[PDB]
Design a protein around this nucleic acid. Sequence first.
RNA 1: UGAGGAUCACCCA
RNA 2: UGAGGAUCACCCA
RNA 3: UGAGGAUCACCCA
RNA 4: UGAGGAUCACCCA
Lengths: 129, 129, 129, 129, 129, 129
Amino acid sequence: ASNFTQFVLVDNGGTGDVTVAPSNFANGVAEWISSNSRSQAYKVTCSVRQSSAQNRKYTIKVEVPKVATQTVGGVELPVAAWRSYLNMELTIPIFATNSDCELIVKAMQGLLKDGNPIPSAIAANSGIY
Amino acid sequence: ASNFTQFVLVDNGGTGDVTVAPSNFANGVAEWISSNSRSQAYKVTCSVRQSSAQNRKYTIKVEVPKVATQTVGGVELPVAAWRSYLNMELTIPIFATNSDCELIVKAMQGLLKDGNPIPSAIAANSGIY
Amino acid sequence: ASNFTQFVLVDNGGTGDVTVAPSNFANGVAEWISSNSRSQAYKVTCSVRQSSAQNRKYTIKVEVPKVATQTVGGVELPVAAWRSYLNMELTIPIFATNSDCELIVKAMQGLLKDGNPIPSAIAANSGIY
Amino acid sequence: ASNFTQFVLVDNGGTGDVTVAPSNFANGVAEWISSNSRSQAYKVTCSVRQSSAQNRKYTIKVEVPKVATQTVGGVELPVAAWRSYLNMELTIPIFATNSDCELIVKAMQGLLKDGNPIPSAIAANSGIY
Amino acid sequence: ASNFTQFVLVDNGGTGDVTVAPSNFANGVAEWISSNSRSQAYKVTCSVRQSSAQNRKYTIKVEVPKVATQTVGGVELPVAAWRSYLNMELTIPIFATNSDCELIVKAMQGLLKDGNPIPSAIAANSGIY
Amino acid sequence: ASNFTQFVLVDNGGTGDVTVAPSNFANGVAEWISSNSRSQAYKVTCSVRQSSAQNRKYTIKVEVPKVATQTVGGVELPVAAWRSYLNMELTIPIFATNSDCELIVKAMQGLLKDGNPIPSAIAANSGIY
RNA sequence: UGAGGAUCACCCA
RNA sequence: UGAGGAUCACCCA
RNA sequence: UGAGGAUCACCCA
RNA sequence: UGAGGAUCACCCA
């Protein structure tokens, strides 16, 4: 059994879907990368640690590239013009049962659901108003 | 027009749904809180700032309480036994168009989609394996 | 295959069986915990290392909790009254064949079989005599 | 009771089973060995002591011979290439009743039961994957 | 995908082929071993890491047993007289696409193809002349 | 004989095959380069040395360039945008027979055969999982 | 290595 | 800890 | 010796 | 910056 598998990061119908596959699990930090040039790839990392006596803490990171070609002196390379960096930390007390954690997960999916305030603000280069 | 409205943070079918409503927008930090005792309420905040010359940065926070009653000296109060703290920061270059931002949003929804590695690890009090 | 699967740690004859499932493989330590809050879960860990040029060493640990509900600060928390710890290390020479290794597994199974001296002493808060 | 008795360590289904018999009781440490030279013998020892004010601890040790290509009664050097050593330590809080102790024994029987991850890994000269 | 699977390491044309199977995944380093004692086993391990800012590096190691005059399941010392070690390091710039990577794999397949200089020298216990 | 001959390093099915030819043996390092300017050529080197009293070590290196044309000082020069480097060392005991050595060659050929885990990961900018 | 300890992937000698 | 920064498992207070 | 590094017959620890 | 902590728009390096 494993949850260290590939998954669809960006679902674009069933085509142009961005799939991220396992790449490295060194030092408790799991990493997933999309295919083709590592320079234009999406990246996801995740780790868990006991942050304190009562807390466990997850550190998730995501990088979404702006795929581009760089031309210098006539030599062109596949690059990412830029990248967005998502950094999230989730602190969960050791008293949380499985039920409690499932609720925490729903809260996270609800926050980002289409039409809700936050994903709407981001998707439109906006803030709250 | 406004995106500073109430929304369903936790969708539990159509009942037992947790709804978070606008509460305060002081200093560029929008806040949403669920109803009833502020002590047992869910909380969501969000703000955007130009973190640097080329970047705009969102700071989103969520608190999911473990609803409980505290009894001290026979006097009982509605409290949260504990809370999970989600803290996320999203950095987006000013070169991102609306299309680019929509993709960033899909990447975030995909990361947390049911069945994918991360939401599965959290929901089960686990790490990656 | 993938031997990293769930199993029933305590067999209470199909009813109240304690099954344990894969939950982390960070740092090369396979972990399995029961479906509980991390404060009340059974935990099993295993790691193998080439301890010497000519040996391999398996380190296995099991934690069996005595679950309770404790009132802290007027609030009830799921807790473990106490925990019992099993720590085992098994050193096997690199010259051991798979059949030599199956011999070690059977010896460990016979050692703890119901009715034999050791599991009888333990279950009765007794020594060998 | 009087549990210090001979028992079947390796059950090969009646034919070629390995029986281990009491061989020493110096200092309260019970010892059992198979009918072999001490260099090629199966050996089991067991002792209990109150490790600290809140715990009792069982120290169980098992030595298993490398059987493939073994010369019965011969001088096989180095000793370390021809022997596997198992060392178990069971720490049990003084509050554990006979029932609590019976469950701990079941947890140990389950951990090593045939077909489960740990015994499968060992028998196949493997780790977890 | 999910490439962590059993494969034929030495193809002797169906009869007496050596198959190597997954045996460890501690730390993200995939391991595969043949069905032998660890002293006589065929072993393969593989890992990837971003070596520096511009490169990714694959570390592949293979251990091959000295088979002539081998005693199956026996204790053969010194270990160094009975084993060959292959250590490969593949450094790939982050700009390499899947296509670039496919060509690199072909360069490796050609270098070792039957009848070419390098494999002929090795197989004949020779150098270049 | 004289195993110092040319061979096709990259087999693109008779059309666009990259063949490499003997080009230097100075200092006991056999070298082979493709028909290009030295700035754009593929390069393969091999040397064998009695690394210890009881071993022999082959050091093999392959360089696969990504060719480009670069404008330096207003003038175009044939250049390599980047290079991928393979470095392999193979240590073989002096006790290895020619058939023991043919076993090592086949193992290396099986390891990289199309379809097997390792060449599949590399070609897909993926790790093993 | 220890019938050393633990609050158990930590500490001791 | 931080609506602290980042070129993102770095760095700052 | 190193799942140490490289601009790759060089450098590091 | 930090797989730095938090009682979470705080605090640390």
